[PDB]
């Protein structure tokens, strides 16, 4: 259906906006990106930077991933991101999210050739 790289783009990339367009951004994005189809994915981060800039992170700061692996890389500088966290009232099928706009360093897991971001590890 898709590739691991394209899946990262679907779940974590939104280069069309410099930041969350409204407090309802996460409710809209989580749905349109098919992240609430089977269940309400609890947490998710979207990156408001060009693909090239996020892909460049694979050549930046090598750090360990949350799972112990060491194919993770942290951005040298901060990026415009939107943290989407499911609200306490949220209940599938009616997924509801709190939209939080921030500027933080991102940590992504890189794989393949071309070595590109495939998993979003965290924002710091
Ligand atoms: Cu920095
Ligand atoms: Cu993987």
48 included as an active-site residue: no
Tokens of 109: 């897991």
Closest ligand to residue 110's CA: 2
Q: How close is the Cα of 64 to the center of ligand 2, in Å?
A: 14
Closest ligand to residue 61's CA: 1
Going 84 to 90 to 94 to 96, the CA torsion angle's sign is negative
10 labeled part of a ligand binding site:
yes
Method of determination is X-ray
CA nearest 72: which of 12, 115, 42? 115
119 included as an active-site residue: yes
SS (HEC) of the chain: CCCHHHHHHHHHECCCCCCCCCCCHHHHHHHHCCCCCCCCCCEEEEECCCHHHHHHHHHCEEECCCCCCCCEEECCCCEEEEEEEECCCCECCECCEEEEEEEECEEEEEECCCCEEEEEEEEC
What CATH number is associated with residue 31? 3.10.130.10
CA nearest 54: which of 121, 111, 113, 108? 108
Q: How close is the Cα of 47 to the center of ligand 1, in Å?
A: 16
The residue segments making up the domain with residue 77 are 1-124
Domain count for the chain: 1
Report resolution in angstroms. 2.0
Q: How close is the Cα of 106 to the center of ligand 1, in Å?
A: 10
């Amino acid at each position: 259906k898709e590739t691991a790289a394209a899946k990262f783009e679907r779940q974590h990339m939104d280069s069309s906006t410099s930041a969350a367009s409204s407090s309802n951004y996460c409710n809209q994005m989580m749905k349109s990106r098919n992240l609430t189809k089977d269940r309400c994915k609890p947490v998710n981060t979207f990156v408001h930077e060009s693909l090239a800039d996020v892909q460049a992170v694979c050549s930046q700061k090598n750090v360990a991933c949350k799972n112990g692996q060491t194919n993770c890389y942290q951005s040298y500088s901060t990026m415009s991101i939107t943290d989407c966290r499911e609200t306490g009232s949220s209940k599938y099928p009616n997924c509801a999210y709190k939209t939080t706009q921030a500027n933080k360093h991102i940590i992504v897991a890189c794989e393949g050739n071309p070595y590109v971001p495939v998993h979003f590890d965290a924002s710091v």
